[PDB]
């Protein structure tokens, strides 16, 4: 139920969802379903 433009893998480093939108093609540090 999240954006179909999502590329899903976890950032094992700081604890981030690198969730990459292959529309413009950019990796978000972020979690859209959370805050941290």
């Amino acid at each position: 139920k999240l954006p179909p433009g999502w590329e899903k893998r976890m950032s094992r480093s700081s604890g981030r969802v690198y969730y990459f939108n292959h529309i413009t093609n950019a990796s978000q540090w972020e979690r859209p379903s959370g805050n941290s």
Binding site: E7, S14, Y18, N25
Partner: peptide, 8 residues
């Protein structure tokens, strides 16, 4: 390929 951002 997109995986594992930390340095950026």
């Amino acid at each position: 390929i997109p995986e594992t951002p930390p340095p950026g």
